Amino acid sequence: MRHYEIVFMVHPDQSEQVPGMIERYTAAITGAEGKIHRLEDWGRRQLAYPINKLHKAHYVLMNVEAPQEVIDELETTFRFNDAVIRSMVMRTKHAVTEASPMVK
């Protein structure tokens, strides 16, 4: 199992849908025997440059140990869900559980 690190930015008008979404993604990972090493809702945040003409995207961070098939499925879900503006699944070597600088 490969340690990943997903960060996805959500449309701020759909910020209320975010708790359910987090639950769904985590649930899928667990269902597929995926561990969840850190989970940080960073919330609404000011973009450094306007994406799709809209500012203030809602950032969610998720460091996960999962299989790659499930990572692929998650990526596909991200791409087709017209809610997540950006995503960034990024491989990591170890269990990076400590809290991130943005929460710090």
């Binding site: 450094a48 440059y49 306007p50 995207a57 961070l61 960034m88 990024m90 991130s100 943005m102």
Partner: protein
């Protein structure tokens, strides 16, 4: 001066926008290693981090109005 020397930084983090802002100029451009004094390995790591942040709109690509 090479900030990471005191740590011997374990890994540079693209989310650490606080320090990456020392390694980008006013216009958003990456500062040369010769000017900031970063070690070459670390400089490469930082550049990668900056690029990732730019992708995630944590840092800006350029100094323009928005």
């Amino acid at each position: 001066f090479c900030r990471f020397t005191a740590e011997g930084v374990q890994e540079i983090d693209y989310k650490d926008i606080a320090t990456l802002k020392n390694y980008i100029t006013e216009s958003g451009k990456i500062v040369p290693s010769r000017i900031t004094g970063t070690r070459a390995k670390y400089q490469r790591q930082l550049a990668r981090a900056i690029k990732r942040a730019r992708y995630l709109s944590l840092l800006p690509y350029t100094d323009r109005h928005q």
